[PDB]
Structures are given as C-alpha cells and as structure tokens.
C-alpha cells in the first residue's frame, strides 16, 4: 500500500500539473503499484496530448520526461495545380492539423498517402511528394507540400479481347472515353480516372446487356505506363454469352390486399425483342412502387434466373415475399430555418396515421422540390420502438436564399441596350407571400410593375394577389421605323389561380386598366379612321384616353426534365386575352402553345413546335386597334425576316413602309439539335437548323393607298398575305452561346419562295433576355 502525497511530474512545459492530476486515474491518497503503468500511456496518447512519455517512480516526484507534441502553426501550401490550395487545406483540416493540434508524424504519413492515392486517381501518376518538415519556433512546424505532377494520362488504343461480336470503332463511339486526336487537345478530354473508368465499365455492361447479350463475363483489365511515367495504355479481356429469347417470366407470392391480376397486367413483357434488361430494372421499380403502395414498404422481391440451354433462353420467376403492412405514426421536419413549419406541411401528401404509400411519397417529393425554396431534400424512414405498424418519417432540408435584387442588361440586334431592374422576394420573412417590384426599360419599351402574391389564400390553396403595372411602348425611334404611337397602360388586376388537379393549375384573372395612346405626325390610313371613330384628333395628330377593363385566362403545363438544356417533355398551354366589355375597345384574342420534343437519337434531337391564335372583334368595336394587334415575323416567330415585317406594307408620307398585322397567327417549327465536339462537353454552345414557315392574314383586300400600292398585283387578295393557307417559306441555321451571361442566339437564315416584296434578314443576333 502507498498513499499519494502530491505526485509530481517533471519534464513538462505547459501540461498544468492540476490537469494531469485530473487525468491520471488516481488522485491524492491512492495506492498504485503497477496498474496504470500503460493505461495512462493509452489515455494521454489518445486525445492528442503526448507521443513519448517516460513514466518513472522515484521519491514521489515522477520524472515524466516528455517531448511535447509539435505544433502545426502555419501550413505551407504550394505545388497544387489542378486542385486548389484552400481545398487541400480544408480537406486536411478535416483530418485535424488545426491550430497547433498536437501534430503527429503518423498523421503526416496518413495524409501524404491519402493525397498521393487521390492524385493517382487523377491523371498524375509519377508524384515526387517531398513534404518538407522544418523545425520552426519552440514547437511550431511547417509542412511544405510539393507535388511533381506528370503531363497527363492519355490512351493510345482502347481494345478488348474476344472482340468478335461488335466492331472496335462503333464500340469506341458508345463508351464515355475517347483517344487523342484533333478534337481532344483542349480541356484535357483524354485524362484517366478510376471512377470514370468504372463508370465506363458499367456503361459497356449496360450496352452489351440491352443489346441482348447476357452475363458479360469481364475477364481482366491491365493498365500499363511507359518510360518516365508519361503515357498510358489500357488492355481489356472479356467474354460474351450470345443472344437469347426470354419469354416466360412469371410471378409467385402472397398478395394479401393487392389482386394478382393487377400485378400480372403491370408485368409488361412479350416473347419478342428477346429481352430488355433495362425494362427488367423498370419492372422491378414499378412493382416496388405499386406493390408497396398498399402499405408494404419492406416488400422484399427475390429474382432468380432459370436458364434453359439448347433453345438458349432464360426465364425469370419472381418470388415476392411481402408482409407486415406499414402505417405511419409521425413525420418530423429538420433544417427548416427562416421558413415556417406550415409552408412545408402544406405541400406534401401522406397526411398521418395512414398506410404508407411510396406512390404519394414520390409525388410529395416532386411537389416540395418544385417549390424552389430548398436545394436538396431526402425522405428517411426510421422505425420506432413500437415497430408493429409504426415507423417514423423524419425530414431533412437544405435551405437556399429566395429574395434578391435583379439588375440585368441585354443587347438585341436592332434596339440595343435593354435594362431590367428590381427587387423580388419569395418569402417576406414569414410564409411565402411572394412580392416583387420589377421595371424594364428599353429604347422603345417601358414596363414598370409591382406585384404581390400568396400561393395559399384558402386552406388548400389559391394564388391571391395584387399588381399595378406601368406598361409603356413607343417605337418612333432609331433606324427601324415601326408604326409610330406611344401607348401607356396602368391599373390593377385580380388574378386567381385554382388547381384543378394535383398536376395542373389553371388561373383566371380580371383587371381594371387605364390606357393613354398618343399618335405622332401624320399617320397611315388605318389610324385616322380609329381616331375619328373612337379616338380624338388634334390637328395633324391623334390621341385617346380611357379604360381597357380586361381579363386573362391561362393554363400551362411543362414537364421537361430540365429548364436549361431541355430533353424529353413538352411545354404546352392555352391563353386568352379577352378585354371584358363595360369600357371602350371591346376586343378579344386567344392563343395556343405546343412545343413537343423527340429524343429519337443519343445525339440528334428534334422538336415539333407550333402555336395558333385568333384575335376576334365583338360588341361595338368591329375593327381591331393597331396598338394591340399582332406583329408577324421576327426571331422567335419565323427565325427569318426582320421583326414586325410580315403582312402587308403601306407607304406613308416621305415613303416609309408600315405593317398592320392580322388577327390570325400561327407557326410550326422543326429543328435538329447536336452539340459541338471541339473541346469537350462544356455546357456553352448548341447548334441547330430550322426550316419553318409563318402565318399572317387580313381577310379583306387592299387596293387604295397613298397613291401607290406596294404589291405587285393591283388587287392582291389580302385574305392571306400569300396563297391559301398563309405562310412564308424560309430556313436556316442557328447557333446559341449559352454562357451564364444570358443566351446569345445567332441565326443565319436563307429565304425560300422569295416574293419580290418580303424584306429578308440573313443574320440575327440576340444577347441576353430581351423579354
């Protein structure tokens, strides 16, 4: 036995003997013979305290001669070329090495091994890593990183063994890896990566699997370097299995609540096409979503291939084994800062205490991600200690800022500078209550607006809000001399949205507006009649002031897989601007929208577009006001002639040409999209070529003008602006630069069936938004 009387440790600098008094498993007045001779070693070696402690026992003052753990004061960073110095610093801080952080040499070895292996994952193989360890002040150490990088790791030949069933070249055209050429020097599109190599391997597995060849026995892969470790060669050996004919799939198992006939019907398969394993994965997914929507989340489906040779076929029996129907007990939400709890509970399905259906959970996920308030969302399902029928659905969010101020500028081919400024907010530090002030202004357009919306007026939801806009437009401007009139509209409008179903959402709107339209020096024929029938003449000019109480009906659906760089999906809708009667200028107009897509090739994609619209007159007003008419021809309309240059052209004083426009517009579009293989798949440019006609008609006929008719035929039937089924042939290519600084669309168009009156526009450039 021994009583401790202030056991002293000697050989320290800052260990604070009281702290080690706390840390030793003993204290004052304790008996220790040999118990913790090594336990204290493990404790202080852990938690990063010391690395070499000599424990002695002599005269109650133990000589703990320790060399204190060196301190990483300032990490020296250099030699990093592809990866950033702050990046290596942060991913090294992930492993410790914080302020003085009791540095250890083994940790240095681990870190250098990690970085060298992660660089071998990249195109750097011969790395002369020399981390210079230097003895700075009392315990400071500076670790210098030096990465002697190789040039790159490109491939000379990509070949397989047993390459008898498919050609080498076409096989290279399908993999996501090419060889050095003339279109590979830029952006180092020939580097070698472990993860990219595994992705290409699984990709060629799916390739051989979809084509009808089974089990794809990959024998081996052999990588080889060269002298000085500069170039790379790859060799592969695989084994095929031939084609088959899979026609006898079947399912067996308990179906307590779901009828077996429904599962058999959803099992889409036929003895033809000999199989599709992608369709196999698809039917597994659909059977897991359907059988599992009745309330069986843990439905484990087993599949075993039954191969019958000779006839060279394989069958698939599906021994589904579901059970223990799953209900829901509670659903929490985490990471919902800056946002109310109700604004998230208001969207998702699967209310509570109901059977758990993934069919509603996926819909809830798409609904909540369609809101835009958050970036990433997950749907976890953790069971409870009352596991029979009780599970938990804790949520997780990744918040993103919503409100911001936009100050954007753009440049169009003819007008030039256009500005759009304003504030916007999707969450006014509360619920949604989205509001925004936005004012756009060009050399010819002026559009101020205040708007305030709330997605949920009622319990389910109504987009209720207000808006006061300041529309103004005047094209009496530089060289492009469009029909001269300055219009300015203001006022308010009730716009009520109402979902008809879970997917679509229609919206009606009524609005009380005031309008002031003032013409300029002597105007064409179609202006004097208006200013003497409804307007007001003033000397050699005309003006009008009044109310334009109007309504707007809208319904638009969009299901593309991406906003930018579109894919399978289609934007469609209907719209109707019907100036409701009660005030002057009783008119109405309808429109349509159809922009079908077709990815009928891995590289070339086509589209079938086209919109149709009629602008009818009713009530007192029989004619159509010019300032609300349609302007055919332009970039988005025909991609050919100049904007607003379709329809008829009338001479005015001093011989200027003006176009009226029709009340029946239509267009159909078709192009072919393929990217540019120059450097890499950098998302910056897209090339296409359109060949589309137009549509513009008047109905009447034009013979009287300012003593001169701009048409060849003296009595040119203006029922159509051309022969029957009004249209103007044209075509041409179109490149688009899709840098984040707005799109730059450059269209080079060639006309077709060129009449001697249609002014052409060979090259059109649009930069920015120009909305």
């Amino acid at each position: 036995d021994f009583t401790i009387q202030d056991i002293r440790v000697e050989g320290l600098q800052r260990t604070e003997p009281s702290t080690v008094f706390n840390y030793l498993p003993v204290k004052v007045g304790d008996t220790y013979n040999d118990t913790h001779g090594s336990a204290i070693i493990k404790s202080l070696y852990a938690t990063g305290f010391f690395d070499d402690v000599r424990v002695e026992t002599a005269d109650g003052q133990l000589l703990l001669t320790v060399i204190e753990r060196p301190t990483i004061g300032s990490l020296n960073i250099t030699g990093a070329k592809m990866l950033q110095n702050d990046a290596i610093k942060k991913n090294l801080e992930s492993f410790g090495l914080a302020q003085s952080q009791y540095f250890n040499q083994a940790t240095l070895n681990q870190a250098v091994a990690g970085l060298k292996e992660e660089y071998l994952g990249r195109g750097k193989l011969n790395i002369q890593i020399t981390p210079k360890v230097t003895k700075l002040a009392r315990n400071r150490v500076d670790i210098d990183i030096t990465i002697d990088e190789g040039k790159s790791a490109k491939i000379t030949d990509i070949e397989f063994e047993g390459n008898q069933v498919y050609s080498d070249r076409k096989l290279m055209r399908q993999m996501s890896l090419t060889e050095g050429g003339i279109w590979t020097w830029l952006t180092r599109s020939d580097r070698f990566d472990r993860q990219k190599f595994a992705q290409d391997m699984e990709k060629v597995t799916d390739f051989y699997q979809n084509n009808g060849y089974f089990d794809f026995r990959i024998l081996d892969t052999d990588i080889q370097t060269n002298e000085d470790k500069t170039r790379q060669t790859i060799k592969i050996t695989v084994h095929e299995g031939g084609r088959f004919r899979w026609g006898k799939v079947s399912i067996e198992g308990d179906t307590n609540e779901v009828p077996k006939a429904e599962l058999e019907k959803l099992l889409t398969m036929k003895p033809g096409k000999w199989y599709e394993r992608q369709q196999m994965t698809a039917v597994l997914g659909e059977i897991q979503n359907r059988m599992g929507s009745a309330g069986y989340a843990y439905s484990e489906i087993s599949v075993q291939p039954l191969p019958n040779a000779g006839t060279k076929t394989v069958d698939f029996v599906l021994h589904i084994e579901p059970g223990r129907k799953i209900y829901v007990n509670e659903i929490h939400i985490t990471g919902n800062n800056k946002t109310r709890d109700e604004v998230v509970r208001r969207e998702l399905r699967q209310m509570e205490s109901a059977p758990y259906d993934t069919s509603k959970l996926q819909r809830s996920k798409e609904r909540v991600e369609l809101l835009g308030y958050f970036d990433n969302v997950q749907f976890d399902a953790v069971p409870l200690a009352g596991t029979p029928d009780k599970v938990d659905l804790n949520m997780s969010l990744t918040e993103r800022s919503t409100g911001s101020l936009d100050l954007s500028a753009g440049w169009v081919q003819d007008t030039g500078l256009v500005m759009s400024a304003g504030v916007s907010q999707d969450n006014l530090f509360g619920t949604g209550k989205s509001a925004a002030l936005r004012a756009s202004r060009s050399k010819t357009t002026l559009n101020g607006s205040l708007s305030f919306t709330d997605p949920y007026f009622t319990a389910d939801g109504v987009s209720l809000g207000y808006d006061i806009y300041g529309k103004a437009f005047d094209p009496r401007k530089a060289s492009t001399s469009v029909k001269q009139y300055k219009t300015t509209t203001a006022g308010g409008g009730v716009r009520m949205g109402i979902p008809v179903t879970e997917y679509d959402r229609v919206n009606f709107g009524l609005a009380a507006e005031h309008l002031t339209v003032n013409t300029y020096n002597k105007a064409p024929k179609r202006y004097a009649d208006f200013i003497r029938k409804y307007g007001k003449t003033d000397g050699a000019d005309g003006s009008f002031k009044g109310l334009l109480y109007k309504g707007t009906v809208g319904w638009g659906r969009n299901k593309t897989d991406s906003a930018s760089w579109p894919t399978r999906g289609y934007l469609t809708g209907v719209n109707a601007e019907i100036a409701l009667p009660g005030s002057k200028l009783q008119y109405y107009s309808a429109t349509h929208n159809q922009t079908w897509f077709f990815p009928l090739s891995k590289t070339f994609t086509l589209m079938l577009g086209g919109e149709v619209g009629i602008a009818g007159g009713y009530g007192r007003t029989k004619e159509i006001p010019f300032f609300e008419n349609f302007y055919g021809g332009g970039l988005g309309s025909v991609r050919g002639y100049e904007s607003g240059t379709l329809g008829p052209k009338v001479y005015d004083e001093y011989g200027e040409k003006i176009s009226y426009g029709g009340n029946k517009k239509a267009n159909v579009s078709a192009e072919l999209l393929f990217p540019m293989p120059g450097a890499k798949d950098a998302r910056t440019v897209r090339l296409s070529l359109f060949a589309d006609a137009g549509s513009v008609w008047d109905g009447r006929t034009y013979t009287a003008a300012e003593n001169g008719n701009n048409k060849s035929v003296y009595s040119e039937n203006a029922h159509k602006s051309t022969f029957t089924n009004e249209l103007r042939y044209s075509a041409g290519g179109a490149v688009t630069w899709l840098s984040p600084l707005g799109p730059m669309k450059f269209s080079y168009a060639y006309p077709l069936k060129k009449k001697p009156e249609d002014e052409i526009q060979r090259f059109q450039f649009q930069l920015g938004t120009t909305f």
Binding site: E330, R340, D341, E342
Partner: protein, 233 residues
C-alpha cells in the same frame, strides 16, 4: 503572421476589446492565437476562445467555436469561467439571429427547428445540473421556459394546421401527445378543445362526454367553452 511585433499582454487585451467594440475580430483572434503561441500559460487563452466564440456568434460559423470550447473542456476542465463558456454554448446554440435586414421584432422563434431547440434545452439542463449557483441563474431558467414555450407553440401550430385539413385521426394522437408530455404550457385549454371537436366529429359520444368532463374539471372558465373551437385565420 505579417507584423510579428512584440507587445504587452494587457495592451493586446485592451486592443482586442476595443476592436470588439469596433467589430474587428478576424485580426483580434489572430492577435489572440499569437499570444497563446508565444505565451501559453495565460487565462487570456480562455478569454480569447470565448470572445472569438462570441464573435462567431455575431458571424455565421459555429463549428470552430464549439471545437475550441470542447478542446478547452478536454484541457482545462476545472476553470471557474467554464459556466460562462457553457452559457456561451447555450448562447451559440440558441441562434438569436442578429440581423437587421430581416429584423421582424415579433420573431416568434418557433420556426427555426426542433433540433437546435431540443439541443439547447438539453444543454441548459446540463447547465443547471452542473453548477447550481453561478453568475447566471435567473436568465438561464427564463430562456429555458421561453424555449419550452416555443417548442409547445410549435407543436400547437402543427396540430392547428392539421386540424385545418380534417385529419381528426391524427390530431387525436397529436393532442394526446401534447396533453401527456407538454404540460405547464399555455396551449392547453385550446388543444383540449380541438380534441373535443375531433371526437365529436369522429362519432365518439362517450369519449366526447368524458373529455368534456375533463374540460369542465380542468378549465372552468375559458372562451373556448362557450364558443366551440374554430380554426383561426
């Protein structure tokens, strides 16, 4: 390390505190770590790891301050100012949200998250259990009852919204949870009314009579007794 000038610890502390007055911390913590690297044996190290935590509390990051205070706990578990650090934890974990661009003086505080609120509750429980008599006892219990009231109000808002949708079979279990584990709150005599309305709407006559007897025995005077409960807004 760009000036590397010899100075006095008292003058460094004065400069650091007047920089705190003038919102200068990035150099203050760099004026903090330098004196700890040169002079390790100083309470100024603890003062630094606490006021840079207060600074990161004015700023956005928290992991650095929490790592520093946990390292301090691992090194000096017997310093008397530990409680303040504890309080600082309860401070940095509370997320006061000091920001004037979205001031909203109301700031019901029941919208941040249940995670941080529950963690702050656990932290304050550990606080009151560790030091029964520190430099702060009234403010701790005050903010504790405030945060438990905020949690109860969050649960009440969830139950209220669920009642706006018709999920009586779910609002039932929600109200059971509230009445069984969320006592001493202010949202009692309203959740009971919602439970009674749900039981009446679910054709539970005996259950409705029993819960209304509990109503009249637990709350003899309440406006929800005369006027049946109606979802506000």
């Amino acid at each position: 390390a760009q000036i590397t000038q010899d100075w006095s610890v008292e003058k460094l502390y004065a400069e650091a505190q007047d920089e705190l007055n003038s919102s200068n911390y990035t150099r203050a913590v760099k004026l903090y770590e330098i004196l700890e690297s040169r002079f390790p044996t100083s309470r100024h190290a603890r003062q630094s790891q606490l006021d840079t935590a207060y600074a990161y509390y004015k700023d956005d990051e928290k992991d650095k301050a929490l790592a520093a205070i946990e390292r301090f706990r691992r090194l000096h578990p017997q310093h008397p100012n530990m409680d303040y650090a504890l309080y600082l934890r309860g401070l940095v974990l509370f997320n006061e949200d000091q920001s004037f661009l979205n001031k909203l003086a109301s700031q019901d505080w029941s919208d941040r998250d249940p995670k941080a609120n529950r963690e702050a509750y656990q932290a304050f429980a550990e606080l009151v259990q560790r030091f029964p008599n520190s430099k702060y006892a009234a403010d701790a219990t005050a903010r504790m009852v405030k945060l438990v009231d905020a949690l109860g109000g969050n649960e009440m808002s969830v139950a209220r919204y669920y009642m706006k949708r018709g999920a009586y079979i779910a609002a039932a279990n929600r109200a059971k949870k509230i009445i069984g584990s969320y006592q001493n709150t202010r949202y009692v005599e309203e959740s009971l009314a919602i439970l009674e309305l749900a039981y009446k709407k679910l054709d539970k006559p005996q259950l409705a009579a029993d819960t209304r007897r509990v109503l009249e025995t637990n709350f003899p005077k309440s406006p929800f007794l005369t006027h049946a409960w109606q979802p506000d807004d």
